[PDB]
Every structure is written in structure tokens, then in C-alpha cells.
Amino acid sequence: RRESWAQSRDEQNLLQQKRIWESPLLLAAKDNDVQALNKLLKYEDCKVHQRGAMGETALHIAALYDNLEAAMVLMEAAPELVFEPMTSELYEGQTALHIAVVNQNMNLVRALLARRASVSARATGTAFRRSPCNLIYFGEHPLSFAACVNSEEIVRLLIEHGADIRAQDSLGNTVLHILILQPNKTFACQMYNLLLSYDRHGDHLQPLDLVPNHQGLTPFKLAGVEGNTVMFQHLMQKRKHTQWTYGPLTSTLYDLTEIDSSGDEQSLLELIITTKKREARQILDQTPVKELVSLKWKRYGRPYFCMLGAIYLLYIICFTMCCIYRPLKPRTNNRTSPRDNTLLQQKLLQEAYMTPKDDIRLVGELVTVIGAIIILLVEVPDIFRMGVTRPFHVLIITYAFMVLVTMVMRLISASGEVVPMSFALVLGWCNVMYFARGFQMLGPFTIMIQKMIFGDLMRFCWLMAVVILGFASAFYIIFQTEDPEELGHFYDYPMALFSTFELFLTIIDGPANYNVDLPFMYSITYAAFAIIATLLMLNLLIAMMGDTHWRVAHERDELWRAQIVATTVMLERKLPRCLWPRSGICGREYGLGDRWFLRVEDRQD
Amino acid sequence: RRESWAQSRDEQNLLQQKRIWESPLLLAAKDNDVQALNKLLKYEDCKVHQRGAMGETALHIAALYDNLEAAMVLMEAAPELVFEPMTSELYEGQTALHIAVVNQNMNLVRALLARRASVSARATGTAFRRSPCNLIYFGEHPLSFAACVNSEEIVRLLIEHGADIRAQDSLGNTVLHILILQPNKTFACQMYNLLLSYDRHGDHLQPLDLVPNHQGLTPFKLAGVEGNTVMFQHLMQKRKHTQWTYGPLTSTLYDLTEIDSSGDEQSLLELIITTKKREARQILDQTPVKELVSLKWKRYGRPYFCMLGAIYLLYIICFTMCCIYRPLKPRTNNRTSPRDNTLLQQKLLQEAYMTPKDDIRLVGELVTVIGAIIILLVEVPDIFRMGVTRPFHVLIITYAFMVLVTMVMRLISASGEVVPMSFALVLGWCNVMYFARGFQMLGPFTIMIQKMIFGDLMRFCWLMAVVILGFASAFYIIFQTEDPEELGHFYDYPMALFSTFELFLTIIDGPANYNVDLPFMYSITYAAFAIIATLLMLNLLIAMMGDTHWRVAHERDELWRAQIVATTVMLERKLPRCLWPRSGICGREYGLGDRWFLRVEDRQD
Ligand SMILES: CC(C)CCC[C@@H](C)[C@H]1CC[C@H]2[C@@H]3CC=C4C[C@@H](OC(=O)CCC(=O)O)CC[C@]4(C)[C@H]3CC[C@]12C
Ligand SMILES: CC(C)CCC[C@@H](C)[C@H]1CC[C@H]2[C@@H]3CC=C4C[C@@H](OC(=O)CCC(=O)O)CC[C@]4(C)[C@H]3CC[C@]12C
Ligand SMILES: CC(C)CCC[C@@H](C)[C@H]1CC[C@H]2[C@@H]3CC=C4C[C@@H](OC(=O)CCC(=O)O)CC[C@]4(C)[C@H]3CC[C@]12C
Ligand SMILES: CC(C)CCC[C@@H](C)[C@H]1CC[C@H]2[C@@H]3CC=C4C[C@@H](OC(=O)CCC(=O)O)CC[C@]4(C)[C@H]3CC[C@]12C
Ligand SMILES: CC(C)CCC[C@@H](C)[C@H]1CC[C@H]2[C@@H]3CC=C4C[C@@H](OC(=O)CCC(=O)O)CC[C@]4(C)[C@H]3CC[C@]12C
Ligand SMILES: CC(C)CCC[C@@H](C)[C@H]1CC[C@H]2[C@@H]3CC=C4C[C@@H](OC(=O)CCC(=O)O)CC[C@]4(C)[C@H]3CC[C@]12C
Ligand SMILES: [Ca+2]
């Protein structure tokens, strides 16, 4: 199932080595063999256009095994074999110019250009596309191939012979975008300068560092999403304008145009926080950005997050107050058939709103219903307007349904409404833990409780729900032939599981009676449940929750700053303008244009 | 709100760059432009006194962007432009001599001194004052500016031209005080020697290392408060007088005048322990001081701290003894209206002191009242005599009120006095934890209990008082329609919070009855409270109290020595002389003057 692509790849690469061993022409191109390559091309031609296992000529082989002399003898006998690409599906459109560039063969690339090779050869195969299957993402063009391998010789050689500097691949990446997607980040900085040096701006469109992809990303914005910090410090030096320097002081000044959210729908700060990478959050510490989100939060962002956290805390007190005064008449019927098993003595009211203390509650209930529709008007026209659904969004909409269920369940006088009022008194209060991110020291406590549930408890609840089902289905059998008035823990099977879950966690004690003879098999089975499940499997979980606290408190300040960017972006697109002005100091009154700058000085030495 | 100071700073620094771009004269001073600076000053003058955005001439710009030749052409056309300072509020009083010194421009400072520049220019701006807003604290004078940048050339150059070595800024700091407030501490040691070398003592007042500030600190005492250890080892070598050396032995001898508390109101040991810095306690390990407070404590300081801890331990036993024998007659009235809810059967006496076993208690009560006025006579005329109130002071005055409340509450025969007797039996005993600092190994256990309450429990009680209010207001609703004779934990709402606080910490068990049918929603809600709140949020707090024990026991001996200095200073000003003599061996009988020395020998090699 969807794994034969790596199986057919390995059969095709072995099919290449079979046809390279059958033909005497092509076996005389692996190891050069100029004595026989003369003699084979002397016979008549012996089929100079022999296609191998993957669409290849005899000149592709001599360029691939780095045979300079075997191609010089071949090109003098080749009428047009520089022109033909490979005609495969795996390696499609790869001319012989591509192969001679990647191997840094400087003498062969001078040869193929001399016989008029096309430098715009679209190598549109499937072994060159951006994929986790392919270990290389070089591009499509020989200028793109020469840039990724860090060869400063062929790059000068191809531009002189007319290579296009603005060519794009299938993913729309210009030749400066692929250099950001390379592992050797230091060598990609020099190639970023050398390729942009061949940009004579002749009233063409945007000058090669602003050309977007099919997604819309510039090379600056692509270096932010991909977590490329070395190609971010180097690309920022075009944008800072250093003012006066005064001994050790240096009053630099950053441009801040593609970083801050303009009238354009996206910004750099929105792309960093919503991407699926982890190294992209490392770029949120650099000197243009760290002084931006800590200036956008100290002013304009903390007072709008505490006013939004004091209305909600005076809302969920208004909901708790109008819910512990719920109606509750004294009874209707007699004590039903179970003798003393059924203790319940209220059976809440039907439809009486008299007695004016209930009219005070009616004002306190309509606030909690209006307050639960406004949640469904700023959350439901977000997901059903953007489509994708990527987690306190889902704990504030679930609260918003459980109030709206209770309204429908009361107007029709349905009976049991203590169940929607128990998913709203605990989902409603435990969302005040969301507002513990405007405080730095209370911030990543919400991170630890996520990584202890979904990372250390969902991985060890499957080895605890097996021991608990093992010993509760053994405790039930032992106390199945007993009298469940004394020692009545395990009286039926749904209670045997709940009263073994509690004995696991050591919250209830552990049963004994001392006035009766407990069955013999209980004293052995419980003395093996106190060992395998109380001190040895519970105290393995508490140790797993003691190095998830450690590896989060070790990076306390980095997890908080990613909670401030994600809050400020959420609070900027919803809360409108004239209450949230642009950050920084504008141009247009200091002779700088329509750009929004942000200066900062730092003592260096 | 009080953040426009950094906003008006950034607009003013951009207003400088606008007026530097409008004037052809001043734009010909950034990049020197000697072709046009000749042509502009040839026209007529074209306003040689043009003030820019911040009070500046055209010569300030040529000194700020390090333009030597643009000022040489300008000063020959400048009639008096060396004289005028900046006339701003930000950069006020800064002449052009200040700017040429900071940039280490040696050729320009020779020029401005040749045209008779004043070297006593009070640069009394607001961008030079000591503040966390300003990244530099250089001073006011060009001799003060040359000392901070570590230039040994201009410092010789200014003293030859008559710079005052004893000048003071607005904060009273002489030129040796600012060198202690510099980050490069190694380079500030050489400048301390070179500036003090120009001190020919000519029957002037105290020789430049004893001149106080407006606070009263000498440069030696300022190096103690500011935590500057490198400027403390270097400044101590003036004070030690080395005696005989005998192979590896070396019997050095320290001066100990500005360290130990003289008749002067302050000492070095009082300033270290009462300042708001943390690096100031690092200086309390150096060789003059560490052998002082460990000689002031082994004798004279431990026997006066254990006699003061055995009177108090025989006082709080006298208070416990006279409080569990409190009067308690057998009743007055009947069992009041609640059936068996009100179990109480004493209702303490009014005013009977007969039956001579009560006359023994009266002697035991007057000791506990006299003992609680003496606390209010050595503590209340301290805070209301010094004004500022900066924490076992507040747990010994709170004990002193709760005894004095109980005296007033008994003489008027008021009813409920079990509440002031319960803030005095627990505040009174838990102050014997104060006297666990005369013991080295019991010492910083009092530090750990502070940093676990005010540092790890006041930060995580706000994420626990939300879950506890969430589940107690859900447990109350479920057991609101029940019979609270069986399973009567949550019978009213103040008890639902207390019986969920206890279920959180796992001190009471967890309710069950097994003879009745508990409601269905309880078995789900409690099985989610045992997970989110017993093993996952409690065992996150216990891990937070396991790396606060670690980071205090790692520095066990440093926290104890700061508890001995703070005890010895407190016990020296209250307990008078003739019971606490001066430490060290005096002069005046060995030909050394009126100084109090302390010798120590150490094997070196
Ligand atoms: C009748 C009166 C009482 C009206 C009551 C309205 C408020 C109690 C509600 C209405 C809309 C709610 C907001 C709707 C959306 C959000 C975003 C939501 O953010 C997330 O889910 C996470 C995003 C992030 O991590 O930044 C958190 C709750 C919050 C602020 C809600 C807080 C409480 C609000 C203001
Ligand atoms: C921290 C570790 C132990 C997590 C492991 C998860 C499970 C082992 C626990 C967590 C939730 C528990 C359940 C939560 C609630 C109930 C309902 C309880 O009784 C009922 O309310 C249903 C009976 C009825 O139908 O009336 C029976 C046990 C059961 C299934 C519990 C069985 C054990 C469960 C699956
Ligand atoms: C009738 C008889 C029993 C008189 C009883 C008097 C003592 C029981 C009281 C009176 C004054 C009290 C003292 C008043 C002041 C202080 C300083 C106080 O120091 C601090 O608060 C912290 C200072 C530091 O950290 O060094 C600690 C308690 C102590 C020694 C008190 C110890 C107990 C004393 C001697
Ligand atoms: C009747 C009920 C409400 C009991 C009330 C008890 C609290 C009011 C008391 C009991 C124990 C006290 C604590 C005991 C010990 C310390 C350590 C103490 O730490 C230091 O003083 C260390 C610094 C130093 O070296 O002086 C600070 C006060 C504190 C937290 C105390 C704070 C107040 C507490 C919690
Ligand atoms: C270690 C963690 C859990 C600290 C978190 C702090 C709070 C969650 C705790 C600490 C003190 C507790 C309070 C201490 C004492 C009381 C009084 C108690 O009943 C009373 O005495 C008042 C009722 C009446 O008026 O008669 C009700 C619970 C309450 C408020 C407790 C509720 C829970 C509190 C606020
Ligand atoms: C009636 C019974 C079933 C009670 C049901 C309780 C649960 C449905 C609730 C109560 C507390 C909740 C948790 C409270 C806090 C968090 C942390 C929260 O973490 C973050 O959002 C961190 C990331 C960020 O910074 O936004 C994720 C949800 C989670 C696990 C919640 C998941 C759902 C929980 C377990
Ligand atoms: Ca128990």
C-alpha cells in the first residue's frame, strides 16, 4: 500500500546497470575505453541513439561517471547528442548539461556550451521535485543546479552564455528561493550575493528579491517560514539604515515593511506562528522582531487582554451564580421501588418563574445566554469561513453549546439538565486558565498541562487500562459469591472498574472489614495490585511527569514569547482599527517615504 | 501612560535626520564635502549659527560623524563655534569638546583645545543622567567622558590644559565614582590608578578616594554596594600592611576602618545587606570581610543569639501552658434549635479568678502580656522612627497584637476568643523557626520555605483556585438533589469548596456509599477530577518544589553567611556597648594610630 514507489525506483536503478552491461557501446562509456570507443563508432555507427533503461544516450553516461575523454571522442562523432534530454518519468528532461554541472566538471561544461547547448532546459522529472522521498531539491535549470552545489565558476559561465536569472520551476521558486532550501546555509549566503549581483534593474518588475512563489512568499518571507536564521540575519542587512554612532552607542534603524501586518492579508508574524515547523520559532528572537512584539504587547496589547479577561471572569461568576440557584421543588412522587438505593428528593421544577427572587435570576440567565451567542458569532464565522481547522477555541465553543443546550432543555421542560450544567461549570471555569498568558511566570504552566495529557498520559493510559481491566475483572469474580452489604465495593461490574481505578491512584483506601472472613483469594490478589499498580506503575507515571516539567521549564521564556505573538495576531484582526494603530514611527514626514520604521540603540563594546 | 518618553525620543532622533537633509551646509558635514563646504561658506556665510533639531551647530555634526577635515575648514571660518553647547533638553550643554573625546578622535581634541575650549563644560542633559533608560552613564565633564571610554591619551591631555580632577556631577559623583559604575571592570582599574596619580595632596581636604557623594559613599563604599568585586580587590591593596613572610607563610594585616561599624552611623556591612542588589552579596566572601563576620559570630554573637533563643522558647511554653488551661464552665443554656448540628458544651467563663489553681495561671498570663509589650517596644519604635518598611519582624509583631487583642477581649468578657488564641499558638510557635540560623545545617531551610511559598505557590495557586472552583461548583449541582445524611460532603456551597480543596491535595479519601445509588454524573466528574487535579496538577506542583530545593541547597553556605551578617548587624545596634566590644586589635599602643586592625596569615605555595 503506497510503498511500491521506492520498490520500482530500486528496480529501475538496477535495470540501468543491466543495459549498461549488455551494450558494448555504453559499457565503453563507464570506464572511458577510448581504444574501443573509437572502434565501435568506426563500424558503421552501431546505433548512436541507443536509449538505455532511463531515456539516456551514450553521452549521458560519459558525463555521469565523469569521463571527459570518452565524451570528447563521442561529441566529434555525435551529430546532435548534446540536444536530446532523458525521456524517462523518473529523470525527465535532464539534458547532458545538467549532469556535467553537478559533478563540478569544469572542462566538460566548456565543451557542451561550445556546441550550443540550451541553458533553459526544463528538467521536469519526478526525481527533482520537492519531496521527502528525494534527497535533493536542486530546481530545473543548470543555473539552479550550479547554485546549490556551491560552484562559483559555472555560475559566471552560464550568465555569460545567456542563462536566465529570473527563471522559475514548477513550484514557482526563482533561483534565490532554492538557496534558502539548502542544508549548507553558510555557502548559500555567498551565492545569494553573487546571483543578486547580476540584477541590473532595467525598469523590469520587482528586483529579484521580491518575486513571489505560487504561495506568495518573497525570499525574505520564505526564510522566515522555513526557520532559516542564517539567511535571515544576512538578508536583514539590506533593510537597516544606521544613524549616528557615538563611541560605543549605535542608533540603528530597521525597515519593518514585510514584517508588520500591512493592508496585505499576511505578515511575517502570521506565517511564523501558523506554520507546522518548530525551527521557525527560533527566528522570533532576532533584533528586528524581538523588539517589535515586545513593544506591541507592553502597550496596546496587555490592557486589551486584561479587559478581555475581566469581563469573562465577571461572566463566569454570573453563570455560577445563576446555576446554584436553579429551581428544585421538594418532590412529586413516593420513594420508588429500590429500598434506600434511591436517595433523591428534589426533582426540579417545571415552569414557575414567580416569586421575584426568580426574576432576579432571569436577568442573570439572559446574560449567560447572550454571552454564549456572542461566542458563537466570533468563533463559528471563523472556522466555517476559512475551512481548515488546524485548543482553547474548542473549549470555548464547547462551553457555548452546553449553555445553548440547557436553554433548549429548559424551554421544553426536559428532565435531566444536571449533565449540561456539569460540562459548563467545568469547561467554563477552566478557560480562565487561558488568560494566564498575559503574565510571564504563569505563562507556560498551560504548556505543561498540555504536554502532560497529550504526550505522557495518552501514551501510558493504554498500559493502565489493561491492568485496571485485569484486576477489576478479578476482584469482581472473588466478591461475586459474597454479601454486598459489608465490603460492597465490587457489587456490580461497572462499579468494579470505578472502584479499581480509584484504588489504582490511591484516593480511596482499600477495602477491609475485620468483622467477617474475607475470601482467601482477595488477600493475594490485592497484595499483588498494591505492588504492580500502586507503587510501581503509578510512580512510573509521576516520573514521566517530572521530566516533562523539566524540559518545558528549561525553555520557559521561549514558550511564553510564542504565546504573545499568537495572542497579538488573534487580537489584531478581530479588534478593528482606530483602537489599534500601526506600530513604529512612520515615514512621509521625515523624508523616508511610506515606510514604517523602528529605531533601537545598543551599547556594543 | 508614561511611555511617550521613548516615543518622543525616537521622533526627535528622526527630526535630526530631516534637518540634516534639508540644509546644504549641514549635509556637507556628514560626509565632509570640502569642495562644497568651501563654496557654501564663501557665499556670504549662509547662516553659520543654524540650529538643527537638537540645538546643534555645523561643527557638532563634523565632530559626531568623525569628520576631521570638515571641521578644520569650518573652524577657520568659525568665529566662536567651539564655545556654544547644544541648547536642547535631551542633549543639553554638550559642547563639541565632549563629542570629539568619546569617538577617540585624537587629532580633533588637539584642535579644540588649541582654540581655547572650556574643559569644565557641565553637560547637564537628560541623556547623560543615571537612569535605566540611558545606556551610558559617562558623567558631565570631558575628563569624565575620557575616563569611561578607556582612553589614556586625552586624560593626560586634559589635565595639562587644566581639567579639574575633583569635579562633581549632579549626583555628586567625583571622577573616581563613575569608573566603578562601568561594565568593563578590568579597564576601570587602570584608570583608577592613572586618575589618582594626579593627586598631589596640598593640604586640601580628603585625598580624592574619600570624597563622599550626596548619599555619603566613598569610592571604596560605592564598590561594596554596587557589587563591584574587581574594584574591591584592587582598592583593598592600599589598606593591607604586610608583615613578615616566612617561607610560604605570609602574615598580612588589613586596615578595617571603613568596613567595621565605627561611631559613624553606617558601615560597609550594613550597606551590603540592606541594598536591593544580588551581586552585592558576592563581595561578602573576600578576605578582609569573611574573616571578620566569622570572627564576630564565633565569639560574642552566637552566645547572645542562643540566650535570646532560650528565653523565647521558655516564653512560648509559658504561653501554651496558660492557654490550654483557659477557664471553660460546663454550660449556660439548653441545646439550641439545630438538632445535633450544634455540638458545643462549654461556653467559657465570664469573670471568676477564684480557686487558687487560677491564681497560678494569673502569674503565667501576666508574663505573656509583659512579654508582648516588650516586643512592641523594640519593634514599633523602629519602623515608626525610620519610616521605610523595606519578614520575621511581621510575624513577631502580629504575635504581639494577638496577645494584646486577647487581653482586651477578656477584660470586657467578649465571647469568642478562640480566634485570637489560634493566630497566636501558630504564629507564636512558628517563630522558633527564626532561631534556626545560628546552626549552619538548619540555616537555609528557612530560605526554602520562603521560596516555595512566595515563589512557587503564589504563582500556581491561581491555576489551582480555578480548577477547585470549577469542580466544586459542579460537585455541588450534582449532589443538590440528594439526601445529605449519606454522602454529605457537598451539603452547602462553602463546604463544597473546602471538601474539594481537600480532595485535591489527597488528604481526605473521596466519597462513596455503596449502599445507595449515587447519581450518574458523579462517577464521570470525579473520575476526571482524579486525573486532571490529583496526579497531574498536584504532581506538577511537587516537581516545582523539587528544583527550588535544588537551587537553594546548591548554594547552602552562601545563603547562611548572609543570614549571619543580617543577624549580627541587628544584634549590634540594639544590644548596647560594654557588652559588645569592638572587633579586632586596636592601634594606639603599637604605633599605628587610632585604627582597628585584623591580621591573618595563610600558607600560599
Ligand atoms: C453579555 C455579556 C456578558 C457578553 C459576554 C461576552 C464575553 C464573556 C465573551 C464573548 C466573546 C468571547 C471571546 C471569544 C473569542 C476568544 C478567543 C479565544 O482564543 C483562543 O481560543 C486561543 C487563541 C490564542 O491562543 O491566542 C479565547 C477566548 C476569547 C478571548 C473569548 C473571551 C470571552 C468573550 C469576550
Ligand atoms: C490516569 C490513568 C488511570 C488514565 C487511564 C484511563 C482509564 C483507565 C480510566 C479513565 C476514565 C475512566 C472511566 C470514567 C468513568 C467511568 C464510568 C463509571 O460508571 C458509570 O458512570 C457508568 C455506569 C452506568 O452505566 O451507570 C464506570 C467506570 C468508568 C468507565 C471509568 C473506568 C476507568 C477509566 C476508563
Ligand atoms: C516577661 C519576659 C518573658 C519577657 C519576654 C521577652 C522576649 C520573649 C521577647 C521580647 C523582645 C523579643 C525580641 C524582639 C526582636 C527580635 C528581632 C526579630 O528579628 C527579626 O525579625 C529578623 C531580623 C534578622 O533577620 O536578623 C526576631 C525576634 C526577636 C529576637 C525577639 C525575640 C523574643 C524577645 C526577646
Ligand atoms: C490559623 C491559620 C491561618 C495559620 C496561619 C499560619 C501562617 C499565617 C504562617 C504559619 C507558618 C508561616 C511561615 C513560616 C516560615 C516562613 C519563612 C520565612 O522566610 C524567611 O524569613 C527567610 C528569610 C530570612 O532569612 O530572614 C518567611 C515567612 C514564612 C513563609 C511564614 C509565613 C506565614 C506562615 C505561613
Ligand atoms: C495549595 C493550593 C491548593 C493553594 C490554593 C489556594 C486555594 C485554592 C485554597 C487555599 C485556602 C482555601 C480556603 C481556606 C478556608 C476556607 C473556609 C471554608 O469555610 C469557612 O470557614 C467559611 C464558611 C463560613 O462562612 O462559615 C471554605 C473554603 C475556604 C474558603 C478555602 C477554599 C480554598 C482555598 C482558597
Ligand atoms: C465533567 C467532566 C468530564 C470534566 C471534563 C473536564 C475536561 C473536559 C477538561 C477540564 C480541564 C481541561 C484541560 C485544561 C487545560 C488544557 C491545556 C491546554 O493547553 C493549551 O492550550 C496550551 C497551548 C497554548 O498555549 O494555547 C489544552 C487543553 C487542556 C489539556 C484541557 C483539556 C480538557 C480538560 C481536561
Ligand atoms: Ca481513609
Curated annotation (Swiss-Prot), chains A, B:
The coding gene here is TRPV6
Q: Where is this region: Interaction with calmodulin?
A: 69-79
**UniProt keywords, alphabetically:** ANK repeat, Calcium, Calcium channel, Calcium transport, Calmodulin-binding, Cell membrane, Disease variant, Glycoprotein, Ion channel, Ion transport, Membrane, Metal-binding, Phosphoprotein, Repeat, Transmembrane, Transmembrane helix, Transport
- Interval of the full protein contained in this chain: 65 to 678 of 765
Lineage of producing organism: Eukaryota, Metazoa, Chordata, Craniata, Vertebrata
Kindly state a single biological-process term from the GO annotations of this entry. Answer: calcium ion transmembrane transport
| Region of interest: Interaction with S100A10 | 565-569
What this protein is called in its record is: Transient receptor potential cation channel subfamily V member 6
Q: Which residues lie on this side of the membrane: Extracellular?
A: 325-361, 411-416, 480-492, 513-523
What does the function comment of this entry state? Calcium selective cation channel that mediates Ca(2+) uptake in various tissues, including the intestine. Important for normal Ca(2+) ion homeostasis in the body, including bone and skin. The channel is activated by low internal calcium level, probably including intracellular calcium store depletion, and the current exhibits an inward rectification. Inactivation includes both a rapid Ca(2+)-dependent and a slower Ca(2+)-calmodulin-dependent mechanism; the latter may be regulated by phosphorylation. In vitro, is slowly inhibited by Mg(2+) in a voltage-independent manner.
Please give the chief subcellular localization of this protein: membrane
